[PDB]
Design a binder for this molecule. Structure first.
Ligand SMILES: CNC(=O)c1cc(C(=O)N[C@H]2C[C@@H]2C)cc(Cc2ccccc2)n1
Length: 111
């Protein structure tokens, strides 16, 4: 965590990693293993990979200085999914659902 707004961000992160959302969050838990998934163009198309384990390490290391920096990494993770995948792939449906969880709770940021 860190500041009051970063504690709200840390709360969101814990929720995104929780059993509550595991049915659609699991593709975002760890970095995409492009080689393992046969996605040999992944790193040509996605210049800045991002995933929830990386967000968690950056939060634990007090890398994020504000909520905006945290949100930019979470949205980068979703954007990468929308950029690489055809819009009818199950992983895109899962990204949309997890981003809905993220955006509605991020909007409840304490001022
Ligand atoms: C963040 N993960 C991913 O982007 C990803 C991508 C692909 C994948 O194969 N993409 C291909 C279709 C483009 C060309 C597969 C998975 C794993 C997965 C499988 C089934 C259901 C949810 C996830 N994750």
């Amino acid at each position: 965590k860190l500041s009051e707004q970063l504690k709200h961000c840390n709360g969101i992160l814990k929720e995104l990693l929780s059993k509550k959302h595991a049915a659609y969050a699991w593709p975002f838990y760890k970095p995409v293993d492009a080689s393992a998934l046969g996605l040999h163009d992944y790193h040509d198309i996605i210049k800045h990979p991002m995933d929830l384990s990386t967000v968690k390490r950056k939060m634990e290391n007090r890398d994020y200085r504000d909520a905006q920096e945290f949100a930019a990494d979470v949205r980068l993770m979703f954007s990468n999914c929308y950029k690489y995948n055809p819009p009818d792939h199950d992983v895109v449906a899962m990204a949309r659902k997890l981003q809905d969880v993220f955006e509605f709770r991020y909007a409840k940021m304490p001022d």
